[PDB]
Amino acid sequence: EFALGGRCLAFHGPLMYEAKILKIWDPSSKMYTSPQKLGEDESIPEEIINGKCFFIHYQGWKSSWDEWVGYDRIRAYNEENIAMKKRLANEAKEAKKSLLEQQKKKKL
DNA sequence: GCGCGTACGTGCGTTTAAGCGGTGCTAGAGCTGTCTACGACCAATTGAGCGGCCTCGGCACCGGGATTCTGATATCGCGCGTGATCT
């Protein structure tokens, strides 16, 4: 499902975004395939370094926002995941509309 | 000044082709030599162009008249609203 250079979805806040995998980290043998060992200037977060994490560059966002990803924050870019990302988007939009309506009512 | 709506701007992704480096080919721009005929120069002269004067008629002036025409009001017609009568 998670192929090097492939497409996927990711967790960031309450809304999902499309991302492309640039590197994949194997913790058992401790290197990433883009087998290249950890660089001095490259650091993987400790919370996910022990697990197989993924370097992903997200679509619709500049190149200088990419970072490493564990299993939890990422998902396969399938029809179910696409629909659920859309659902999260509509939920956020409705929540914002409800908040602004509540503020307007309070002001009155 | 206010309100709407939409159409550029900003940004990210994908695609295109500009750009650079390299080599080949030959077309034409440049240069050189030679030669001829075209133009400047000169002299003579006569005729086309210019200054001037005269005659006249095209057009500027002035007066009277016809014609738009611009603006308002009003009349008449059409449409909308209110009242009265019929179903």
Side-chain angles (χ1 to χ4, degrees), chain A residues 1 9 13 16 29 35 46-47 58 67 69-72 74 78 81 83 85 89 94:
Chain A
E1 297 188 352
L9 293 194
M16 309 301 69
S29 39
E46 298 177 355
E47 304 176 3
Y58 321 77
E67 41 99 347
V69 172
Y71 325 117
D72 62 311
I74 189 172
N78 55 19
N81 283 313
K85 159 179 167 185
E94 287 179 1

Coordinates of all heavy atoms in Angstrom, one line a residue, chain A residues 1 9 13 16 29 35 46-47 58 67 69-72 74 78 81 83 85 89 94:
Chain A
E1 N 0.8 -1.2 0.0 CA 0.0 0.0 0.0 C 0.9 1.3 0.0 O 0.6 2.2 -0.7 CB -0.9 0.0 1.2 CG -1.9 -1.1 1.2 CD -3.0 -1.0 2.4 OE1 -2.8 -0.1 3.2 OE2 -3.9 -1.8 2.4
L9 N -2.4 9.4 2.3 CA -3.0 10.4 3.1 C -2.4 10.5 4.5 O -1.8 9.5 4.9 CB -4.6 10.2 3.2 CG -5.4 10.4 2.0 CD1 -6.9 10.5 2.3 CD2 -5.0 11.6 1.2
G13 N -3.5 17.9 12.4 CA -4.7 18.4 12.9 C -5.9 17.5 12.7 O -5.7 16.3 12.7
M16 N -7.2 15.6 6.8 CA -6.2 14.8 6.0 C -5.8 15.6 4.8 O -6.5 16.4 4.3 CB -6.8 13.5 5.6 CG -7.5 12.7 6.7 SD -6.5 12.2 8.2 CE -6.3 13.7 9.0
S29 N 16.7 -2.8 10.6 CA 18.1 -2.6 10.1 C 18.5 -1.2 10.0 O 19.7 -0.9 9.6 CB 18.1 -3.3 8.7 OG 16.9 -3.0 8.0
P35 N 19.2 1.5 0.5 CA 19.5 1.6 1.9 C 20.6 2.6 2.2 O 21.8 2.4 1.9 CB 20.0 0.2 2.2 CG 19.4 -0.7 1.1 CD 19.3 0.2 -0.1
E46 N 12.2 10.8 17.8 CA 12.4 9.6 18.7 C 11.1 8.8 18.8 O 11.1 7.6 18.9 CB 12.9 10.0 20.0 CG 14.3 10.6 20.0 CD 14.8 11.1 21.3 OE1 14.0 11.0 22.3 OE2 16.0 11.5 21.4
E47 N 9.9 9.6 18.8 CA 8.7 8.9 19.1 C 8.3 7.9 18.0 O 7.5 7.0 18.2 CB 7.6 10.0 19.1 CG 7.8 11.0 20.2 CD 6.7 12.1 20.2 OE1 5.8 12.0 19.4 OE2 6.8 13.1 21.0
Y58 N 4.1 16.6 1.2 CA 2.7 16.8 1.0 C 2.3 17.6 -0.2 O 3.1 18.5 -0.6 CB 2.0 17.3 2.2 CG 2.5 16.9 3.5 CD1 3.7 17.4 4.1 CD2 1.8 16.0 4.3 CE1 4.2 17.0 5.3 CE2 2.2 15.5 5.5 CZ 3.4 16.0 6.0 OH 3.9 15.6 7.2
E67 N 8.3 16.0 6.5 CA 8.8 15.5 7.7 C 8.5 14.0 7.7 O 7.8 13.5 6.8 CB 8.2 16.2 8.9 CG 6.7 16.5 8.8 CD 5.8 15.5 9.5 OE1 6.3 14.4 9.9 OE2 4.6 15.8 9.7
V69 N 7.1 10.3 9.2 CA 5.8 9.8 9.5 C 5.8 8.4 9.9 O 6.3 7.5 9.3 CB 4.8 10.0 8.3 CG1 3.5 9.3 8.5 CG2 4.6 11.4 8.0
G70 N 5.1 8.1 11.1 CA 4.8 6.8 11.5 C 3.5 6.3 11.0 O 2.8 6.9 10.2
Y71 N 3.1 5.1 11.4 CA 1.9 4.5 11.0 C 0.6 5.3 11.4 O -0.3 5.4 10.6 CB 1.7 3.0 11.5 CG 3.0 2.3 11.6 CD1 3.5 1.8 12.9 CD2 3.8 2.0 10.5 CE1 4.6 1.2 13.0 CE2 5.0 1.3 10.7 CZ 5.4 0.9 11.9 OH 6.6 0.2 12.1
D72 N 0.6 5.8 12.6 CA -0.6 6.3 13.2 C -1.1 7.5 12.4 O -2.3 7.7 12.2 CB -0.3 6.7 14.6 CG 0.7 7.8 14.8 OD1 1.8 7.6 14.2 OD2 0.5 8.8 15.5
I74 N -0.7 8.4 9.3 CA -0.8 8.2 7.9 C -1.8 7.1 7.6 O -2.1 6.2 8.4 CB 0.6 7.8 7.3 CG1 0.6 7.8 5.8 CG2 1.1 6.5 7.9 CD1 2.0 7.6 5.2
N78 N -7.0 5.5 -0.5 CA -8.1 4.6 -1.1 C -9.4 5.4 -1.1 O -9.5 6.5 -0.5 CB -8.2 3.3 -0.4 CG -8.4 3.4 1.0 OD1 -8.8 4.4 1.6 ND2 -8.1 2.3 1.8
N81 N -10.6 6.2 2.4 CA -9.8 7.2 3.1 C -10.1 8.6 2.4 O -10.2 9.6 3.1 CB -8.3 6.9 3.0 CG -7.9 5.9 4.0 OD1 -8.2 5.9 5.1 ND2 -7.2 4.9 3.5
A83 N -13.0 9.5 1.0 CA -14.3 9.9 1.5 C -14.2 10.4 3.0 O -14.9 11.4 3.3 CB -15.3 8.7 1.4
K85 N -11.6 11.7 4.5 CA -10.9 13.0 4.5 C -11.9 14.1 4.1 O -12.0 15.1 4.7 CB -9.7 13.0 3.5 CG -9.3 14.3 3.0 CD -8.1 14.2 2.1 CE -7.9 15.5 1.4 NZ -6.8 15.4 0.3
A89 N -13.2 17.2 6.3 CA -13.3 18.6 5.8 C -14.6 19.3 6.0 O -14.7 20.4 6.5 CB -12.9 18.6 4.3
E94 N -18.4 22.9 8.9 CA -19.6 23.1 9.7 C -19.3 23.6 11.1 O -20.1 24.4 11.6 CB -20.4 21.8 9.7 CG -21.0 21.4 8.4 CD -21.8 20.1 8.4 OE1 -21.8 19.5 9.5 OE2 -22.4 19.7 7.4

